[PDB]
């Protein structure tokens, strides 16, 4: 298989993604939720880890490690500490609104991922640490946790498999950096959303000191989909190393913005002509594209063309494949000025722990308010390179590197357009 | 804006703060869902309750929260004042999001906080003089494919215009509550034009299910 | 600590008086700036010996080795959790 994309209505994981159908119990158990999960618990941590580990799945929340050797970090034996699964709820990247959807409308789903993540690491329970913005999101999975209760399908002898689970739901307090796994662990321990240092990973210390995995909804709500089809199938789809589905947020400059699944290399000009309606302009329109949400760096209209929107083929056209959420810009937008405000929003959203990421963001947003009017001459290109590059790879979580590599992204592909701008101002104030 | 206390008349350890009853079952209710010996997990949640019951957080409801929890007031200090929910000064009733990061402000966020800014005849950061509305431009709120978008107090109204905010700060303004979605045709996240996936049915239980399960 | 490297010989510190005229620091002991630097401990014992001085030794003091876990600032049933970070 060599072409990739058009992915059917069969094939989709997230049924009822778009609301069209009863998001509750009775609507759910109608789509393949909440079907043979006693037999899937039944069959030990090993089973299905290894069909989690057959299934290529990575990392849905952006990172892209993989998830079932992630997961098989928890495999290990009981040292007097319980166990925890918890789910990264957060989602506060521009460009990325995925995961509410997964929450508002496929919460089923949520919760039998939940189940069958946390009998693959052993988990005691599960807190999905939710959005606080998400608020109606979040009664909406609780009413749907109640229903899990209720039907006896999560807590005491959960789907009559003898496990004990319940799942817990934390609202956060609106803060960006609280999705990062380490500062969510510190948002629920009742502190500051602080990121901890690496190692210790939360399979060893994490939430409450205790073993601990953080996932994506998407990456837990997509394991028993993978543990009932089988890892083969789900590793079918996309390239190698690129295994699956997912849910991209074609956002931005185009006719119809939109949250829809496709194959996981879906060409992604094939994608915005295919299910945004294209660019408003046609192609002949385009200026630059952020591929998978605001710490991605940008790519211009002559790499898009024949791009992937994978891991291997984003990060080959030196960005990211991060959060699959595609930000569409035209030729009517002043570029400059949106990766200023998008520097702006890195320094709103970054909680000030590090000396790096405390001051040098704060340092590029003046540097960039400086470039929007032009105010400032060709050397401080350069400079804020070697900003950006001293920002990247020296702070304790990759909001310094998210925050770095937009700035990397608009130097590398539009130098000419920050030197013109400069010159214009030195021409029209002097 | 500013992340220290000056004892004001209105806002000091006098200040009257206490929850009701059925509060006192909530916190329960949130403290139980957090082991033993980690009563401090629950912070959040409970000044949550507290801006919930009071609409914002003097510094009484931070002091009763510590002194429930048994944490130092301090670090209940460091969590209103790390979160931009904590209302550390009192907000009108109807507190306005507007979102204004980049997803939004391709899809043209300026021309809505203009019309909130000519309609209610305030800027960024007032109040009305009738206390029921304030106006903040905040971050991405995560509704980026129904850009532009707003957040009232709970609730997100998406794919906005200028007319669209208009008629409903008017209905607000009325004293009812309008439908917290898209103001567009859609109804969440779909293209707009129609429905380029999941046209068909599904396929109910047990489709694809591998041998040996 | 750069500065705890090298042994020092400095002496017993004589009167510090107000000059008259400008309230200056006057002294009458010649010896009272003279600070020397040793390697060794035995190096500044045998000058001090050589040179009819009477001193006294007081030992290096290495400051001792700790033990250190970040992990530790996040326990589970330890009184070593922080309240912060
Ligand atoms: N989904 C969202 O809303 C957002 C996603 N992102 C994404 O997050 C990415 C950064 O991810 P990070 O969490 O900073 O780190 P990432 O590089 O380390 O690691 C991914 C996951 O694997 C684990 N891991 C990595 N190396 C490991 C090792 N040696 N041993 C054990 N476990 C290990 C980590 O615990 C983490 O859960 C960005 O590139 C961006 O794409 C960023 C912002 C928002
Ligand atoms: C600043 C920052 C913010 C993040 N925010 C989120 C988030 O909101 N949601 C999410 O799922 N992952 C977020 N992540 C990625 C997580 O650290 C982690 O990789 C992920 O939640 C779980 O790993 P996974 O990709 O295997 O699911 C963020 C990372 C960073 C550095
Ligand atoms: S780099 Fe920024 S986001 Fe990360 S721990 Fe430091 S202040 Fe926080
Ligand atoms: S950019 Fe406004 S909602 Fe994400």
Redesign the pocket.
């Known amino acids: 298989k060599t072409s990739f994309g058009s992915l059917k209505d069969e094939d989709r994981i997230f049924t009822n993604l778009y609301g069209r159908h009863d998001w509750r119990l009775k609507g759910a158990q109608s789509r393949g939720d909440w079907y043979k999960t006693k037999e899937i618990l039944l069959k030990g941590p090993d089973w299905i880890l290894g069909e989690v580990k057959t299934s290529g799945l990575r ?7 993989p ?1 079932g050797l ?1 997961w098989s970090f928890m495999n290990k034996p009981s040292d007097g500490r319980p166990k925890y699964l918890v789910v ?1 709820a ?4 521009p460009g990325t609104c995925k ?1 509410r959807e997964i929450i508002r409308h496929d919460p089923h789903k949520l919760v039998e991922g939940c189940l069958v993540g946390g009998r693959a690491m052993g988990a005691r329970a599960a807190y999905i640490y939710i959005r606080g913005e998400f608020y109606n999101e979040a009664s909406n999975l609780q009413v749907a946790i109640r229903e899990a209760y209720e039907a006896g399908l999560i807590g005491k002898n959960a789907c009559g498999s003898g496990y004990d689970f319940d799942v817990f739901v934390v609202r956060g307090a609106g803060a ?2 609280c ?3 380490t500062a969510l662990i510190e948002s629920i321990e009742g502190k500051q959303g602080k990121p901890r240092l690496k190692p210790p990973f939360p399979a060893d210390v994490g939430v409450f000191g205790c073993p601990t995995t ?4 998407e ?1 837990v709500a997509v394991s028993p989909t993978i543990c009932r089809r089988g890892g083969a199938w789900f590793a079918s789809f996309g390239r190698e190393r690129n295994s699956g589905t997912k849910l991209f947020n074609i956002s931005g400059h185009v006719n119809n913005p939109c949250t829809v699944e496709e194959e996981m290399s879906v060409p992604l000009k094939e994608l915005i002509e295919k299910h945004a309606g294209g660019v408003t302009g046609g192609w002949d329109n385009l200026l630059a594209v952020i591929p998978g949400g605001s710490s991605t760096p940008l790519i211009p209209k002559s790499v898009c063309e024949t791009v992937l929107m994978d891991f291997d083929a984003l990060i080959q056209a030196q960005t990211g494949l991060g959060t699959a959420a595609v930000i569409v810009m035209d030729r009517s937008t002043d570029i400059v000025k949106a990766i200023a405000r998008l520097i702006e929003f890195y320094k709103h959203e970054s909680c000030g722990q590090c000396t790096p990421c405390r001051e040098g963001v704060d340092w590029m947003n003046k540097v960039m308010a400086r470039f929007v009017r032009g105010d400032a001459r060709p050397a401080e290109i350069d400079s804020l390179w070697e900003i950006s590059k001293q920002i990247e790879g020296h702070t304790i ?3 310094g590197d ?1 925050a770095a590599w937009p700035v990397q992204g608009l130097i590398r592909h539009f130098r000419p357009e920050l030197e013109e701008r400069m010159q214009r101002f030195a021409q029209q104030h002097q | 804006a500013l992340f220290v206390h000056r004892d004001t008349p209105k806002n000091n350890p006098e200040t009257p703060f206490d929850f009701t009853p059925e509060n006192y079952k909530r916190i329960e209710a949130i403290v139980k869902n957090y082991p033993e010996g980690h009563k401090a997990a629950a912070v959040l949640p409970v000044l949550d309750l507290a801006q919930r019951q009071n609409g914002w957080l003097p510094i009484s409801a931070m002091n009763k929260v510590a002194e429930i929890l048994q944490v130092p007031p301090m670090r209940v200090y460091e969590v209103a004042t790390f979160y931009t929910m904590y209302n550390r000064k009192p907000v009108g009733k109807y507190h306005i999001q507007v979102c204004t990061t980049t997803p939004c402000m391709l899809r043209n966020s300026d021309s809505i906080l203009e019309a909130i800014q000519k309609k209610l005849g305030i800027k960024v950061g007032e109040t009305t003089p009738d206390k029921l509305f304030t106006l903040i431009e905040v971050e991405c709120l995560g509704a980026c494919v129904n850009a532009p978008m707003v957040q009232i107090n709970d609730n997100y109204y998406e794919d906005l215009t200028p007319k669209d905010i208009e008629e409903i700060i008017d209905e607000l303004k009325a004293g009812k509550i309008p439908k917290p979605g898209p103001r567009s045709g859609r109804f969440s996240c779909e293209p707009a034009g129609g429905l380029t996936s999941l046209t068909e049915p599904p396929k109910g239980p047990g489709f694809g299910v591998q041998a040996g399960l | 600590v750069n500065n705890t490297k090298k042994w020092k010989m400095e002496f017993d510190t004589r009167e510090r008086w107000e000059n008259p005229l400008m309230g200056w620091a006057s002294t009458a002991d010649p010896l009272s700036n003279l600070v020397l630097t040793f390697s060794t401990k035995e190096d500044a014992i045998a000058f001090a010996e050589k040179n009819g001085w009477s001193y006294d030794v007081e030992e290096r003091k290495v400051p001792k080795p700790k033990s250190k876990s970040y992990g530790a600032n996040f326990s589970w049933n330890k009184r070593t959790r922080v309240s912060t970070k």
């Open positions: 990392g849905r929340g952006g990172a892209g490690f998830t992630k990264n957060d989602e506060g990247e995961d960006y950096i999705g990062e796994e953080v996932a994506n909804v990456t979580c990759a909001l998210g």
